Short mmCIF file of C-alpha atoms in Angstrom, two decimals:
data_model
loop_
_atom_site.label_atom_id
_atom_site.label_comp_id
_atom_site.label_asym_id
_atom_site.label_seq_id
_atom_site.Cartn_x
_atom_site.Cartn_y
_atom_site.Cartn_z
CA UNK A 1 -0.01 0.02 -0.01
CA UNK A 2 2.72 2.51 0.95
CA UNK A 3 4.62 1.80 -2.30
CA UNK A 4 1.55 2.42 -4.43
CA UNK A 5 1.06 5.65 -2.52
CA UNK A 6 4.42 7.26 -3.32
CA UNK A 7 3.85 6.29 -6.95
CA UNK A 8 0.47 8.13 -7.06
CA UNK A 9 1.96 11.26 -5.43
CA UNK A 10 5.10 11.34 -7.58
CA UNK A 11 2.98 10.89 -10.71
CA UNK A 12 0.41 13.50 -9.74
CA UNK A 13 3.23 15.98 -9.20
CA UNK A 14 4.45 15.18 -12.74
CA UNK A 15 0.99 15.85 -14.16
CA UNK A 16 0.71 19.22 -12.37
CA UNK A 17 4.22 20.02 -13.68
CA UNK A 18 3.21 19.29 -17.28
CA UNK A 19 0.05 21.34 -16.88
CA UNK A 20 2.23 24.34 -15.91
CA UNK A 21 4.52 23.65 -18.92
CA UNK A 22 1.51 23.39 -21.27
CA UNK A 23 -0.09 26.53 -19.84
CA UNK A 24 3.10 28.43 -20.60
CA UNK A 25 3.15 26.85 -24.05
CA UNK A 26 -0.37 28.14 -24.77
CA UNK A 27 0.49 31.61 -23.50
CA UNK A 28 3.57 31.70 -25.72
CA UNK A 29 1.55 30.42 -28.75
CA UNK A 30 -1.25 32.86 -27.90
CA UNK A 31 1.22 35.81 -28.01
CA UNK A 32 2.81 34.56 -31.24
CA UNK A 33 -0.71 34.53 -32.74
CA UNK A 34 -1.38 38.11 -31.61
CA UNK A 35 1.81 39.40 -33.22
CA UNK A 36 1.02 37.64 -36.49
CA UNK A 37 -2.47 39.15 -36.62
CA UNK A 38 -1.06 42.66 -36.12
CA UNK A 39 1.77 42.03 -38.61
CA UNK A 40 -1.18 41.91 -41.06
CA UNK B 1 -8.89 35.07 -4.30
CA UNK B 2 -7.31 38.58 -4.24
CA UNK B 3 -3.56 38.56 -5.09
CA UNK B 4 -1.71 41.86 -4.45
CA UNK B 5 1.36 43.02 -6.41
CA UNK B 6 4.04 45.19 -4.86
CA UNK B 7 7.67 46.30 -5.31
CA UNK B 8 7.17 48.34 -8.46
CA UNK B 9 8.56 51.84 -9.00
CA UNK B 10 11.10 53.88 -10.97
CA UNK B 11 14.61 52.84 -12.01
CA UNK B 12 17.27 54.00 -14.47
CA UNK B 13 18.27 51.63 -17.35
CA UNK B 14 20.30 48.86 -15.84
CA UNK B 15 18.66 48.95 -12.37
CA UNK B 16 16.88 46.24 -10.45
CA UNK B 17 13.57 45.54 -8.63
CA UNK B 18 11.99 42.71 -6.74
CA UNK B 19 8.25 42.50 -7.43
CA UNK B 20 6.19 40.68 -4.83
CA UNK B 21 2.95 38.71 -5.19
CA UNK B 22 1.03 38.02 -1.98
CA UNK B 23 -2.43 37.09 -0.89
CA UNK B 24 -2.97 37.68 2.84
CA UNK B 25 -4.44 34.68 4.62
CA UNK B 26 -4.75 32.70 1.39
CA UNK B 27 -2.15 29.93 0.89
CA UNK B 28 -0.57 29.91 -2.59
CA UNK B 29 1.46 26.76 -1.89
CA UNK B 30 -0.76 24.73 -4.23
CA UNK B 31 -0.92 27.22 -7.07
CA UNK B 32 0.93 27.84 -10.25
CA UNK B 33 1.82 31.56 -10.19
CA UNK B 34 2.55 33.62 -13.31
CA UNK B 35 3.71 37.21 -13.84
CA UNK B 36 2.29 39.23 -16.74
CA UNK B 37 2.96 42.78 -17.82
CA UNK B 38 1.09 45.32 -19.92
CA UNK B 39 2.69 48.33 -21.58
CA UNK B 40 0.96 51.53 -22.77
CA UNK B 41 -1.29 50.64 -25.66
CA UNK B 42 0.13 47.11 -26.14
CA UNK B 43 -1.44 43.75 -25.35
CA UNK B 44 -0.83 41.87 -22.12
CA UNK B 45 2.27 39.68 -22.23
CA UNK B 46 3.50 36.73 -20.21
CA UNK B 47 6.74 37.35 -18.33
CA UNK B 48 7.53 34.42 -16.06
CA UNK B 49 5.97 31.45 -14.34
CA UNK B 50 6.68 29.04 -11.48
CA UNK B 51 4.98 25.73 -10.78
CA UNK B 52 3.33 24.70 -7.54
CA UNK B 53 6.26 22.56 -6.44
CA UNK B 54 8.69 25.29 -7.58
CA UNK B 55 10.36 22.51 -9.58
CA UNK B 56 9.93 24.47 -12.80
CA UNK B 57 10.46 28.05 -13.92
CA UNK B 58 9.64 29.60 -17.32
CA UNK B 59 10.73 32.93 -18.75
CA UNK B 60 9.75 35.05 -21.72
CA UNK B 61 12.46 35.04 -24.28
CA UNK B 62 12.97 38.64 -24.01
CA UNK B 63 13.59 38.59 -20.36
CA UNK B 64 15.66 35.51 -20.21
CA UNK B 65 18.70 35.86 -18.09
CA UNK B 66 17.69 39.00 -16.40
CA UNK B 67 14.66 38.09 -14.38
CA UNK B 68 14.39 35.30 -11.85
CA UNK B 69 11.28 33.95 -10.26
CA UNK B 70 11.13 32.26 -6.89
CA UNK B 71 8.71 31.47 -4.16
CA UNK B 72 8.80 31.08 -0.39
CA UNK B 73 5.81 29.20 1.01
CA UNK B 74 6.77 30.33 4.52
CA UNK B 75 6.16 34.01 3.58
CA UNK B 76 3.29 33.01 1.24
CA UNK B 77 4.82 35.13 -1.49
CA UNK B 78 6.18 34.70 -5.01
CA UNK B 79 8.99 37.04 -6.06
CA UNK B 80 10.07 38.24 -9.43
CA UNK B 81 13.57 39.55 -9.32
CA UNK B 82 14.29 41.86 -12.19
CA UNK B 83 17.85 42.75 -13.14
CA UNK B 84 19.13 44.84 -15.98
CA UNK B 85 16.03 46.63 -16.88
CA UNK B 86 15.59 48.37 -20.09
CA UNK B 87 13.00 50.83 -21.23
CA UNK B 88 10.94 48.18 -22.81
CA UNK B 89 10.25 46.72 -19.47
CA UNK B 90 8.09 49.58 -18.61
CA UNK B 91 4.60 48.37 -18.09
CA UNK B 92 2.11 47.54 -15.39
CA UNK B 93 3.00 44.08 -14.00
CA UNK B 94 0.32 41.64 -12.91
CA UNK B 95 0.10 38.47 -10.83
CA UNK B 96 -2.16 35.40 -11.32
CA UNK B 97 -2.66 31.77 -10.39
CA UNK B 98 -1.96 30.62 -13.96
CA UNK B 99 0.71 30.93 -16.61
CA UNK B 100 -1.88 31.25 -19.35
CA UNK B 101 -3.62 34.64 -19.45
CA UNK B 102 -6.79 33.06 -20.75
CA UNK B 103 -7.18 31.05 -17.54
CA UNK B 104 -7.13 34.27 -15.41
CA UNK B 105 -10.54 35.62 -14.34
CA UNK B 106 -9.52 38.54 -12.07
CA UNK B 107 -6.62 40.92 -12.58
CA UNK B 108 -5.14 42.93 -9.70
CA UNK B 109 -4.42 46.61 -9.79
CA UNK B 110 -0.93 45.55 -10.84
CA UNK B 111 2.18 47.48 -9.81
CA UNK B 112 3.74 50.11 -12.07
CA UNK B 113 7.29 49.69 -13.31
CA UNK B 114 8.73 52.66 -15.22
CA UNK B 115 12.23 52.55 -16.50
CA UNK B 116 13.80 55.56 -18.17
CA UNK B 117 16.33 58.41 -17.76
CA UNK C 1 -0.10 35.01 -44.30
CA UNK C 2 -3.66 33.59 -44.13
CA UNK C 3 -2.35 30.00 -43.79
CA UNK C 4 -0.10 30.62 -40.82
CA UNK C 5 -3.08 32.17 -38.94
CA UNK C 6 -5.34 29.13 -39.07
CA UNK C 7 -2.35 26.96 -38.14
CA UNK C 8 -1.68 28.96 -35.05
CA UNK C 9 -5.39 29.02 -34.05
CA UNK C 10 -5.76 25.41 -34.72
CA UNK C 11 -2.76 24.44 -32.75
CA UNK C 12 -3.48 26.79 -29.84
CA UNK C 13 -6.96 25.28 -29.61
CA UNK C 14 -5.32 21.82 -29.55
CA UNK C 15 -3.20 22.94 -26.61
CA UNK C 16 -6.19 24.19 -24.71
CA UNK C 17 -7.87 20.82 -25.30
CA UNK C 18 -4.88 18.92 -23.87
CA UNK C 19 -4.89 21.28 -20.86
CA UNK C 20 -8.55 20.37 -20.21
CA UNK C 21 -7.77 16.68 -20.71
CA UNK C 22 -4.81 16.79 -18.33
CA UNK C 23 -6.84 18.82 -15.86
CA UNK C 24 -9.39 15.97 -15.87
CA UNK C 25 -6.66 13.33 -15.47
CA UNK C 26 -5.27 15.24 -12.50
CA UNK C 27 -8.62 15.31 -10.75
CA UNK C 28 -9.00 11.58 -11.30
CA UNK C 29 -5.53 10.86 -9.87
CA UNK C 30 -6.02 13.24 -6.95
CA UNK C 31 -9.18 11.36 -6.09
CA UNK C 32 -7.47 7.97 -6.40
CA UNK C 33 -4.78 9.21 -4.02
CA UNK C 34 -7.37 10.27 -1.42
CA UNK C 35 -9.05 6.83 -1.56
CA UNK C 36 -5.70 5.17 -0.98
CA UNK C 37 -4.99 7.47 1.92
CA UNK C 38 -8.31 6.47 3.52
CA UNK C 39 -7.51 2.78 3.05
CA UNK C 40 -4.57 3.28 5.38
CA UNK D 1 -18.18 34.45 -9.26
CA UNK D 2 -20.09 31.70 -11.11
CA UNK D 3 -23.57 30.91 -9.84
CA UNK D 4 -25.09 27.41 -9.96
CA UNK D 5 -28.82 26.95 -10.12
CA UNK D 6 -31.35 24.25 -10.74
CA UNK D 7 -31.56 21.31 -8.52
CA UNK D 8 -33.78 20.65 -5.61
CA UNK D 9 -35.64 17.50 -4.58
CA UNK D 10 -36.36 14.65 -6.97
CA UNK D 11 -37.64 11.10 -6.71
CA UNK D 12 -35.07 8.28 -7.11
CA UNK D 13 -34.89 7.70 -10.85
CA UNK D 14 -35.88 11.28 -11.67
CA UNK D 15 -33.92 14.02 -13.38
CA UNK D 16 -32.74 17.61 -13.01
CA UNK D 17 -30.99 20.15 -15.19
CA UNK D 18 -28.27 22.11 -13.46
CA UNK D 19 -27.09 25.34 -15.10
CA UNK D 20 -23.90 27.36 -14.62
CA UNK D 21 -23.85 31.03 -15.44
CA UNK D 22 -22.03 34.30 -14.65
CA UNK D 23 -24.09 37.38 -15.44
CA UNK D 24 -21.99 39.84 -17.43
CA UNK D 25 -18.90 37.56 -17.74
CA UNK D 26 -18.62 35.76 -21.08
CA UNK D 27 -17.73 32.05 -20.43
CA UNK D 28 -17.02 31.28 -24.11
CA UNK D 29 -13.29 31.10 -23.41
CA UNK D 30 -13.32 29.01 -20.25
CA UNK D 31 -13.15 25.35 -19.37
CA UNK D 32 -16.13 24.68 -17.17
CA UNK D 33 -16.18 21.87 -14.63
CA UNK D 34 -18.88 20.46 -12.36
CA UNK D 35 -17.94 19.15 -8.92
CA UNK D 36 -20.12 17.83 -6.11
CA UNK D 37 -19.69 17.31 -2.40
CA UNK D 38 -21.86 14.90 -0.41
CA UNK D 39 -22.34 14.97 3.34
CA UNK D 40 -19.08 14.74 5.31
CA UNK D 41 -17.16 13.53 2.21
CA UNK D 42 -14.57 15.03 -0.05
CA UNK D 43 -15.43 17.09 -3.13
CA UNK D 44 -15.28 15.13 -6.33
CA UNK D 45 -15.36 15.75 -10.02
CA UNK D 46 -18.49 15.02 -12.00
CA UNK D 47 -18.04 16.34 -15.54
CA UNK D 48 -16.49 19.21 -17.40
CA UNK D 49 -16.46 20.66 -20.92
CA UNK D 50 -13.68 22.32 -22.86
CA UNK D 51 -13.97 25.90 -24.11
CA UNK D 52 -14.75 24.83 -27.66
CA UNK D 53 -17.13 22.06 -26.45
CA UNK D 54 -15.07 19.68 -28.53
CA UNK D 55 -14.46 17.48 -25.44
CA UNK D 56 -16.59 16.33 -22.47
CA UNK D 57 -15.51 14.28 -19.49
CA UNK D 58 -17.56 12.31 -17.03
CA UNK D 59 -16.88 10.57 -13.74
CA UNK D 60 -17.19 6.83 -14.09
CA UNK D 61 -20.02 6.69 -11.49
CA UNK D 62 -22.01 8.91 -13.76
CA UNK D 63 -21.28 7.90 -17.32
CA UNK D 64 -24.44 7.19 -19.31
CA UNK D 65 -26.71 9.18 -17.00
CA UNK D 66 -25.31 12.72 -17.08
CA UNK D 67 -24.76 14.96 -20.10
CA UNK D 68 -22.82 18.29 -20.04
CA UNK D 69 -23.25 20.90 -22.69
CA UNK D 70 -23.01 24.58 -23.25
CA UNK D 71 -24.37 27.45 -25.13
CA UNK D 72 -22.31 30.53 -25.80
CA UNK D 73 -25.24 32.46 -26.95
CA UNK D 74 -26.95 31.90 -23.70
CA UNK D 75 -23.60 31.95 -21.91
CA UNK D 76 -24.50 28.95 -19.88
CA UNK D 77 -23.18 25.43 -19.19
CA UNK D 78 -25.73 22.83 -18.39
CA UNK D 79 -25.65 19.52 -16.77
CA UNK D 80 -28.51 17.19 -17.52
CA UNK D 81 -28.90 14.53 -14.79
CA UNK D 82 -31.00 11.49 -15.69
CA UNK D 83 -31.73 8.38 -13.65
CA UNK D 84 -30.69 10.08 -10.39
CA UNK D 85 -29.81 7.87 -7.44
CA UNK D 86 -29.63 8.58 -3.70
CA UNK D 87 -25.84 8.37 -4.01
CA UNK D 88 -26.01 11.51 -6.22
CA UNK D 89 -27.26 13.64 -3.31
CA UNK D 90 -24.74 16.42 -2.81
CA UNK D 91 -24.06 20.12 -3.24
CA UNK D 92 -23.08 20.64 -6.89
CA UNK D 93 -20.52 23.26 -7.87
CA UNK D 94 -19.45 25.06 -10.98
CA UNK D 95 -15.90 26.28 -11.79
CA UNK D 96 -13.62 27.39 -14.68
CA UNK D 97 -11.50 24.31 -14.33
CA UNK D 98 -11.77 20.53 -14.46
CA UNK D 99 -9.07 20.16 -11.75
CA UNK D 100 -10.37 21.04 -8.30
CA UNK D 101 -6.90 22.25 -7.24
CA UNK D 102 -7.10 25.02 -9.86
CA UNK D 103 -10.28 26.49 -8.33
CA UNK D 104 -9.89 29.64 -6.19
CA UNK D 105 -13.57 30.40 -5.36
CA UNK D 106 -16.37 27.92 -4.73
CA UNK D 107 -19.95 29.08 -5.03
CA UNK D 108 -22.79 28.53 -2.68
CA UNK D 109 -23.38 25.48 -4.83
CA UNK D 110 -26.91 24.27 -5.40
CA UNK D 111 -28.40 21.38 -3.43
CA UNK D 112 -29.44 18.12 -5.19
CA UNK D 113 -31.43 15.72 -3.04
CA UNK D 114 -32.60 12.36 -4.39
CA UNK D 115 -35.18 10.78 -2.11
CA UNK D 116 -38.70 9.46 -1.86
CA UNK D 117 -39.73 11.82 0.95
CA UNK D 118 -41.27 14.37 -1.43
CA UNK E 1 17.53 21.49 -44.97
CA UNK E 2 14.37 19.31 -44.71
CA UNK E 3 13.97 15.80 -46.08
CA UNK E 4 10.69 13.93 -45.87
CA UNK E 5 10.19 10.25 -46.55
CA UNK E 6 7.85 7.36 -45.72
CA UNK E 7 4.68 8.24 -47.60
CA UNK E 8 2.99 6.10 -50.17
CA UNK E 9 -0.21 4.17 -50.91
CA UNK E 10 -2.06 2.38 -48.06
CA UNK E 11 -5.33 0.63 -47.33
CA UNK E 12 -7.89 2.15 -45.00
CA UNK E 13 -7.00 0.98 -41.54
CA UNK E 14 -3.32 0.69 -42.37
CA UNK E 15 -0.15 2.25 -40.93
CA UNK E 16 2.63 4.51 -42.09
CA UNK E 17 5.69 6.08 -40.42
CA UNK E 18 6.84 9.37 -41.82
CA UNK E 19 10.36 10.74 -41.29
CA UNK E 20 11.65 14.26 -41.50
CA UNK E 21 15.41 14.86 -41.41
CA UNK E 22 16.15 18.44 -40.41
CA UNK E 23 19.25 20.53 -40.20
CA UNK E 24 20.55 21.30 -36.68
CA UNK E 25 19.62 24.97 -36.83
CA UNK E 26 15.93 24.25 -37.59
CA UNK E 27 15.63 21.35 -35.14
CA UNK E 28 17.84 21.50 -32.05
CA UNK E 29 15.97 22.95 -29.07
CA UNK E 30 12.89 23.87 -31.19
CA UNK E 31 9.40 22.43 -31.33
CA UNK E 32 8.91 20.39 -34.49
CA UNK E 33 5.62 19.57 -36.07
CA UNK E 34 3.94 17.79 -38.92
CA UNK E 35 1.51 19.52 -41.31
CA UNK E 36 -0.50 18.16 -44.15
CA UNK E 37 -2.11 19.64 -47.24
CA UNK E 38 -5.26 17.83 -48.45
CA UNK E 39 -6.11 18.04 -52.16
CA UNK E 40 -7.37 21.44 -53.22
CA UNK E 41 -7.24 22.62 -49.62
CA UNK E 42 -4.88 24.75 -47.50
CA UNK E 43 -1.98 23.45 -45.45
CA UNK E 44 -3.15 22.51 -41.95
CA UNK E 45 -1.43 21.88 -38.66
CA UNK E 46 -1.49 18.28 -37.37
CA UNK E 47 0.82 17.66 -34.39
CA UNK E 48 3.74 19.11 -32.40
CA UNK E 49 6.55 17.73 -30.25
CA UNK E 50 8.85 19.74 -28.01
CA UNK E 51 12.54 19.15 -27.51
CA UNK E 52 11.63 17.34 -24.27
CA UNK E 53 9.00 15.18 -25.94
CA UNK E 54 5.71 16.87 -24.96
CA UNK E 55 3.18 16.26 -27.72
CA UNK E 56 -0.21 17.52 -28.79
CA UNK E 57 -2.37 16.77 -31.85
CA UNK E 58 -5.16 18.07 -34.03
CA UNK E 59 -8.61 16.74 -33.25
CA UNK E 60 -8.94 14.79 -36.49
CA UNK E 61 -5.77 12.76 -35.79
CA UNK E 62 -5.53 12.64 -31.97
CA UNK E 63 -5.33 9.07 -30.71
CA UNK E 64 -4.36 7.55 -34.09
CA UNK E 65 -1.11 9.41 -34.90
CA UNK E 66 1.97 9.52 -32.66
CA UNK E 67 4.74 12.08 -33.13
CA UNK E 68 8.27 11.43 -31.86
CA UNK E 69 11.75 12.80 -32.33
CA UNK E 70 15.35 11.59 -32.18
CA UNK E 71 17.37 14.49 -30.78
CA UNK E 72 20.71 12.79 -31.73
CA UNK E 73 19.68 12.47 -35.41
CA UNK E 74 17.68 15.73 -35.71
CA UNK E 75 14.86 13.66 -37.06
CA UNK E 76 11.10 13.84 -36.53
CA UNK E 77 8.78 10.93 -37.04
CA UNK E 78 5.02 10.56 -37.42
CA UNK E 79 3.52 7.15 -36.76
CA UNK E 80 0.12 6.98 -38.51
CA UNK E 81 -2.27 4.23 -37.39
CA UNK E 82 -5.89 3.42 -38.28
CA UNK E 83 -5.60 5.49 -41.50
CA UNK E 84 -8.78 6.94 -43.08
CA UNK E 85 -9.39 8.34 -46.58
CA UNK E 86 -9.63 11.83 -45.02
CA UNK E 87 -5.97 11.62 -44.08
CA UNK E 88 -4.90 11.79 -47.77
CA UNK E 89 -2.61 14.80 -48.27
CA UNK E 90 0.98 15.80 -48.76
CA UNK E 91 2.59 15.75 -45.30
CA UNK E 92 5.21 18.31 -44.29
CA UNK E 93 7.41 18.66 -41.27
CA UNK E 94 8.81 21.96 -39.99
CA UNK E 95 9.79 23.87 -36.90
CA UNK E 96 6.65 24.54 -35.08
CA UNK E 97 5.51 27.91 -35.99
CA UNK E 98 5.92 27.14 -39.68
CA UNK E 99 7.37 30.02 -41.60
CA UNK E 100 6.23 30.80 -45.14
CA UNK E 101 8.87 29.95 -47.72
CA UNK E 102 10.73 27.43 -45.53
CA UNK E 103 8.94 24.25 -46.65
CA UNK E 104 10.15 20.97 -48.08
CA UNK E 105 8.79 18.92 -50.91
CA UNK E 106 6.71 16.82 -48.51
CA UNK E 107 5.56 13.21 -48.67
CA UNK E 108 2.30 12.26 -50.40
CA UNK E 109 -0.02 9.88 -48.51
CA UNK E 110 -2.89 8.20 -50.32
CA UNK E 111 -5.52 5.94 -48.71
CA UNK E 112 -8.01 3.78 -50.57
CA UNK F 1 1.12 -11.22 -16.95
CA UNK F 2 3.61 -8.60 -17.93
CA UNK F 3 6.90 -9.44 -19.61
CA UNK F 4 9.56 -6.79 -20.10
CA UNK F 5 12.63 -7.16 -22.29
CA UNK F 6 15.38 -5.09 -23.84
CA UNK F 7 17.45 -4.06 -20.78
CA UNK F 8 21.14 -4.67 -20.35
CA UNK F 9 24.56 -3.14 -19.81
CA UNK F 10 25.42 0.23 -21.29
CA UNK F 11 27.96 3.05 -20.79
CA UNK F 12 27.11 6.60 -19.60
CA UNK F 13 25.66 8.56 -22.53
CA UNK F 14 24.27 5.40 -24.17
CA UNK F 15 20.82 4.29 -25.35
CA UNK F 16 18.33 1.46 -24.61
CA UNK F 17 14.84 0.52 -25.75
CA UNK F 18 12.73 -1.51 -23.30
CA UNK F 19 9.65 -3.47 -24.36
CA UNK F 20 6.68 -4.64 -22.35
CA UNK F 21 4.24 -7.29 -23.58
CA UNK F 22 0.84 -6.72 -21.96
CA UNK F 23 -2.15 -8.98 -21.50
CA UNK F 24 -4.70 -6.81 -23.34
CA UNK F 25 -6.78 -7.09 -20.20
CA UNK F 26 -4.27 -4.89 -18.37
CA UNK F 27 -3.42 -2.84 -21.50
CA UNK F 28 -6.43 -2.20 -23.67
CA UNK F 29 -7.88 1.29 -23.06
CA UNK F 30 -5.84 1.85 -19.86
CA UNK F 31 -2.89 4.08 -19.07
CA UNK F 32 0.41 2.21 -19.12
CA UNK F 33 3.64 3.07 -17.41
CA UNK F 34 7.20 2.23 -16.64
CA UNK F 35 8.55 1.84 -13.12
CA UNK F 36 12.03 1.08 -11.76
CA UNK F 37 13.75 -0.20 -8.63
CA UNK F 38 17.24 1.29 -8.12
CA UNK F 39 19.60 -0.63 -5.87
CA UNK F 40 18.73 -0.15 -2.17
CA UNK F 41 15.70 1.99 -3.03
CA UNK F 42 11.93 1.50 -3.46
CA UNK F 43 10.11 0.95 -6.76
CA UNK F 44 9.38 4.32 -8.29
CA UNK F 45 7.11 5.48 -11.09
CA UNK F 46 8.88 6.76 -14.18
CA UNK F 47 6.48 7.53 -17.02
CA UNK F 48 2.86 7.15 -18.05
CA UNK F 49 1.16 7.00 -21.45
CA UNK F 50 -2.55 7.20 -22.04
CA UNK F 51 -4.45 5.13 -24.65
CA UNK F 52 -4.39 8.22 -26.92
CA UNK F 53 -0.68 8.89 -26.47
CA UNK F 54 -0.60 11.65 -23.90
CA UNK F 55 2.64 11.27 -21.91
CA UNK F 56 4.20 12.43 -18.68
CA UNK F 57 7.49 11.63 -16.95
CA UNK F 58 9.23 11.75 -13.57
CA UNK F 59 11.45 14.77 -12.88
CA UNK F 60 14.65 12.65 -13.00
CA UNK F 61 14.06 11.31 -16.55
CA UNK F 62 11.98 14.06 -18.22
CA UNK F 63 13.63 15.06 -21.52
CA UNK F 64 15.82 11.88 -21.74
CA UNK F 65 13.25 9.02 -21.78
CA UNK F 66 10.38 8.71 -24.21
CA UNK F 67 7.43 6.32 -23.63
CA UNK F 68 5.24 4.97 -26.40
CA UNK F 69 2.70 2.27 -27.04
CA UNK F 70 1.49 0.01 -29.88
CA UNK F 71 -2.24 -0.36 -29.40
CA UNK F 72 -2.43 -3.19 -32.00
CA UNK F 73 0.18 -5.24 -30.16
CA UNK F 74 -0.69 -4.44 -26.52
CA UNK F 75 2.96 -3.38 -26.17
CA UNK F 76 4.54 -0.45 -24.37
CA UNK F 77 8.01 0.95 -25.06
CA UNK F 78 10.54 3.08 -23.12
CA UNK F 79 13.29 4.66 -25.25
CA UNK F 80 16.06 5.65 -22.83
CA UNK F 81 18.58 8.24 -24.03
CA UNK F 82 21.48 10.08 -22.38
CA UNK F 83 21.69 7.39 -19.68
CA UNK F 84 23.29 8.20 -16.31
CA UNK F 85 24.41 5.82 -13.56
CA UNK F 86 21.36 6.90 -11.47
CA UNK F 87 19.28 5.22 -14.19
CA UNK F 88 20.65 1.85 -13.05
CA UNK F 89 17.67 -0.14 -11.82
CA UNK F 90 15.38 -3.04 -12.58
CA UNK F 91 12.60 -1.73 -14.84
CA UNK F 92 8.95 -2.92 -14.72
CA UNK F 93 5.90 -2.06 -16.73
CA UNK F 94 2.26 -2.01 -15.52
CA UNK F 95 -1.03 -0.11 -15.61
CA UNK F 96 -0.60 3.31 -14.05
CA UNK F 97 -2.32 2.58 -10.77
CA UNK F 98 -0.06 -0.46 -10.62
CA UNK F 99 -1.70 -3.79 -9.97
CA UNK F 100 -0.48 -4.77 -6.57
CA UNK F 101 -0.87 -8.29 -7.62
CA UNK F 102 0.84 -8.61 -10.94
CA UNK F 103 4.41 -7.62 -11.54
CA UNK F 104 6.39 -9.31 -14.27
CA UNK F 105 10.06 -10.19 -13.72
CA UNK F 106 11.29 -6.75 -14.89
CA UNK F 107 14.35 -6.06 -17.02
CA UNK F 108 17.76 -5.31 -15.52
CA UNK F 109 19.42 -2.05 -16.69
CA UNK F 110 23.02 -1.08 -15.74
CA UNK F 111 24.84 2.14 -16.48
CA UNK F 112 28.52 2.67 -15.61
CA UNK F 113 32.04 3.05 -17.02
#
């Protein structure tokens, strides 16, 4: 039971970490889209 | 709920500032925190971000190497240390529980950063 | 010019979709972790 | 500041339509997620819908009975609850996230009670 | 500077693995992605992979295609499973925000 | 009923590709993952892949390992690049909430010079 528990925690932390990384990716891509629209 | 930005002010090109993001009585430990900025007449930009665990930091390309983001759960504050400022860093800086502006539903007052001689 | 615009929009939307999907995975894993904790 | 509404009392096997709205705040661009919290238990995810509505998710306990959908024109997200069971009794909550840990404000919620009292 | 291979003719339900060999300036540390141009239509985005192997995909292909990269060989791969007639197009790889005028000859994919 | 293969002895900076043959009961429609047991330590989660190829990885291997799956063959793969001695462990595959009951033999992986 304890072993399964550290695995759940360690993996959940990895998912939260990728969410942050993906959020930043969207923000960056969102900005790149704004500049392209105004480059018009 | 209600994040408050602080530390902004005036500096000459090349100076430094430490912006603070705090939320009295509301623990940020479990939140992504992201710094945005908005300049006169331009659209709101992402500046930096730090994950809940603090295991990961992200930086706008333009600010890479000058700014550093960090967090201390004990003081319930996230910091943005800004070195080597240039006049293009002048903007109102904003704090949020997300790195992605579109996830943010409430924007603070921000704190004003003006850099120029 | 026109092409790059739809590509950005299309890809940004795809990132938002993965964010939502990972958000949902996180909730499911957070819940599984709580149930394990109660089994202790 | 999203407000949940709908919900009330229903007979076991009955149905309700929950709605999620935010007067004057356009939801078009937000993930919307439904959570629920039953007596003395921990809050759990029920369903949520992506901004574009291209994707819906459902808790396993609820697959086949609930349907989430949204209308930008009406600026509302709805949750249709069919074949309700006593175990679905809870306060139901609305939020701009599918991941509870992302949520910074919880509503009053709206109470759903499934019972053969009245 | 870009070299695509692996396309061809395939039955519905089949598989294909595309390859894109890129030069180190285009590839190293940059997101790489696959695009495709269906007949008579405009070139559309399909999938992306970051230098550290985070991926995301267009709706029409999510769950059937798998993008991967070999950082030592500056190569990007697209594994295409459960192929459908809709997937017929010329496929192109590029750095992720694809820049006009920087495209390769592509690889044609036909399904029927 | 999990059977992993492909491990072995490799020098720092090297490569390895592990394979996992799954039962189809464990595999089909479920998230699959790699775990590892370093000497003197506990079995730790390493990477996860969903049925539709969404991936995530532990901090220590992110950017160096890449997980993938073959849904036709009920097989899961772990491509290990830029290997470091810390990566020395016995590797096992399983469904992401690992089945307490069923662990295959694993595949030994050694990194050193």
